Amino acid sequence: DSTVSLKGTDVFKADSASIAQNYTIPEWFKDAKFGIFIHWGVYSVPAYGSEWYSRWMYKEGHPINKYHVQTYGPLTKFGYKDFIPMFKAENFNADEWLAVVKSSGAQYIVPVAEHHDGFAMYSSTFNKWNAVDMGPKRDIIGELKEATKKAGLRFGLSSHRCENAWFYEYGMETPSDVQDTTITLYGERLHEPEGQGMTPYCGKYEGSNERSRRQFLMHTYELIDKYQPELIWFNWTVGKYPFQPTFYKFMAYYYNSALDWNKEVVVNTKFGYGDNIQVFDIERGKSDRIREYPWQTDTSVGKKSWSYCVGEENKSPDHIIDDFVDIVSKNGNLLLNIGPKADGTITDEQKNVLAEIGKWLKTNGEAIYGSRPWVIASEGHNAGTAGYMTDNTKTEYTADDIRFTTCDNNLYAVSLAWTDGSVTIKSLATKYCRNVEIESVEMLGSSEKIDYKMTDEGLVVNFPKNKPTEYAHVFKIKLKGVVVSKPLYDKVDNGCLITVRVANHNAEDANVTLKSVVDGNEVSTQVAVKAKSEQWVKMQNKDVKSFDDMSCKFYFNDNLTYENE
C-alpha cells in the first residue's frame, strides 16, 4: 500500500536518513504546550478495571475474565463484539467535548481513532467494525474534526491498531468467539512480543505478521486521507524491530501528504526512533533534564485507567499543574487524558480538573504558550518524578522549587507553591552571570509592585500579599546580560561529557569563554552567542579514570561557576 503511492519525486522516502534530511519538528507543537487525550470506545460500556478489558476477558482465570462470565455470560455466548450494540452513545456531542477541551486552555485534541480492540471510531471502509455502521452509528472522528475547527484548535488522533495483532491471543486458548477466525475484529491472534518496558527488542514473538503490517498501512492512510490530522499518536509496539520498516513507510507518506496539505504535522512514538525525526513521548512520566528536541508527556486525569471505569481516583489540579510546568520547563508538552462515560458524558470531576487548568492558564499563560526552556529548568530541593510510569507520585513542592521558561527574551520563574515571605532565584547568582541588570520584576495576575533585591546568592523576590491563582505562581523578569547554567555531567569512555546552556539577554552579540577542569584535564571553548538567544554547549574531558570520584571545576570567563570540593 505504501510502495504503491510512493513516487520517485516525493521528498520523503521510507528510511530515517531521508526523514532527517527534510523534516523538522514544527513550531506549532513547540508553542502549543497543552493537549487533551480522550480514551473512549467499546471498552467504556463495561467500564471495569481499564481499557484492557478486551484482552483480559479472554484469559481464563484473570479477574476480568471471571467478572465477565458472571456479569455478561460465557465467552462463547457474550464476546467483546456483543458490547457494541450497547455502545449507543446517547449523550455524545462533539461540540460539548471541544467546549470542555477549549475550557482547559489546551491547543490540540487527540481522540482515539482505534484502540487495541480493533473497533474503528470513524468512517472506515477498511474495517467493517466501525462506529458508523455499528454502535454510535456516527463518524466520531469526523464530528470531532468539525467541532475542533469551529473551536479554533488543532485536530490530532491516536492509533493503537498495532497491538491488535496479538491483543486477543488468549481467546484462542479458551473456548470463546475469538476462535471464530471469520471475525476480523479480533486481529491476528498472535503472541505478545517479549521485552519488558519501552524497548524495541521483541525476542521469540514478533508481535506482528506481514498481514497486520499491510493492514496498519491501509489503516493509517485511511486516517490520513479522510481527516488529514496535524498529529498522529501511536502506542508502544510500533517501535519493535520487525515493525520499524513498515512504520517508516507511514512516516514517509504522512510527511509527504503534509507538504501537499500546506500543513506541518507531528508523529508520536514512545521508543524506537530518533528524537529528531518524530516527537518522543513518555507514558505517565516526564524528563528530569531539558531535552534538545521537543517531547511530549501523555497521562490520564484518573490514576488507574485511561478510559472511564467505576471507582477511579482522579488527580488534583495542583498535581497536574505542578507537573505541567515542570514538563514545559524541559521543552516538553503535556497530553492530558480524560475518560468519558459510555454514553459520552465527561465526568464532573474531570471537567473541574480541566477548568482549573484553564483558569490557571488564563492568568499565567504568558509563561507557557510559545515559550522555550531557559539555561536551567529547575532549582530548589525537590527534583520531582521522572521516567516511564512515575506520574502518580505527587511531589510536595515549596516556594523555593522554581521552574523556568523564556519567551521573547523575557524570563519567567514559576514557584510551584505559595509563601508569604521571599524566595531567592539561585540561578541568577553572580557566578552564573556577567553584567546582569534586572529591569523589572512582575507576578502575572497581580497588580502589586514586587519588591526585589539582586544579591550575590541570587535575586531575592518577595511575594505579594494576595494570590492571583493557586497551584503555581509566575514571576516575569525582564533582564539583560549573559547567564550560564550549572553544568551537568555524563559518562563516556575514559572521560566525561559536560553540557551547559548560555542565554545572552543583551541586545548585542556577546563572546563567551567556557572552561571545564576535570581531574586536571583542561578543555576550553569560545562561543559567540547572538543577541537575545540561547545555545547548547557540549564539551568533553579526557583522561578521566573514575567518573564517580571526579574532581570537577567549571569556569565562566575565568570565574568559578561549579565545583565539588
Ligand SMILES: O=[N+]([O-])c1ccc(O[C@@H]2O[C@@H](CO)[C@@H](O)[C@@H](O)[C@@H]2O)cc1
Ligand atoms: O509495556 N506495557 O506493559 C504497557 C505499555 C503501554 C501501556 O499503555 C498503553 O498506552 C496507554 C496510553 O499511554 C493506553 O492507551 C493503554 O491502553 C495502552 O496499553 C500499558 C502497558
Ligand SMILES: [Ca+2]
Ligand atoms: Ca503547587
Ligand SMILES: [Cl-]
Ligand atoms: Cl527553538
Ligand code: NA
Ligand atoms: Na482543526
Ligand code: NA
Ligand atoms: Na507468533
Ligand code: NA
Ligand atoms: Na525580604
Ligand code: NI
Ligand atoms: Ni493527587
Ligand code: NI
Ligand atoms: Ni498555592
